[PDB]
């Protein structure tokens, strides 16, 4: 009710690799997202910007997605090369069992910024040590002399490779 789309914790058995789209584990090279899946989509801005979007369809003929920008005003459609679409994780990685499926300190990532529907460049400050905790990240911010925000929390749901 309150937390629509919250991610399940990956629980693997012996000898199971953390799968593609578990935390930091990348999608396979031929991966195709389904209608309804959430993605980071690189679109033209005013400049380009990674936005939170929802897949509408994919054409294997053109290798282009149709995606809808998720905004409060209503949807805007974009047609994008698969090169401009990063699938969001479908599981959160459990640091207690699959710590290697988390982005490590200082890794460059794209992360959702608070009170936006956009992804921006950030460095990992700390991966979570417990499954109930999120990432701490430093966002690039050119308004500050050293170029970075203070540490801000971002759920695994909204941190992807840059």
């Amino acid at each position: 009710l309150y937390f629509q789309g919250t991610l399940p914790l990956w629980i693997g058995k012996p000898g199971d690799k953390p799968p593609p789209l578990c935390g930091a584990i990348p999608a396979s090279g031929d991966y195709v997202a389904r209608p309804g899946d959430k993605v980071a989509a690189r679109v033209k801005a005013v400049d380009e910007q990674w936005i939170l979007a929802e897949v509408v369809s994919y054409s294997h003929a053109t290798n282009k997605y149709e995606v809808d920008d998720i905004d409060e005003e209503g949807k805007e459609r974009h047609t994008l090369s698969r090169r401009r679409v990063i699938p969001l994780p479908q599981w959160k990685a459990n640091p207690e069992t699959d710590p290697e499926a988390l982005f490590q300190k200082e890794q460059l990532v794209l992360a959702l910024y608070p009170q936006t529907t956009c992804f921006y460049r950030a460095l990992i400050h700390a991966p979570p040590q417990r499954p109930q905790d999120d990432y701490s990240v430093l966002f690039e911010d050119t308004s500050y002399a050293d170029g970075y925000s203070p540490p801000l929390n971002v759920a695994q749901r909204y941190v992807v490779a840059c």
Partner: peptide, 4 residues
């Protein structure tokens, strides 16, 4: 999209 809502930007920062």
């Amino acid at each position: 999209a809502r930007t920062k």
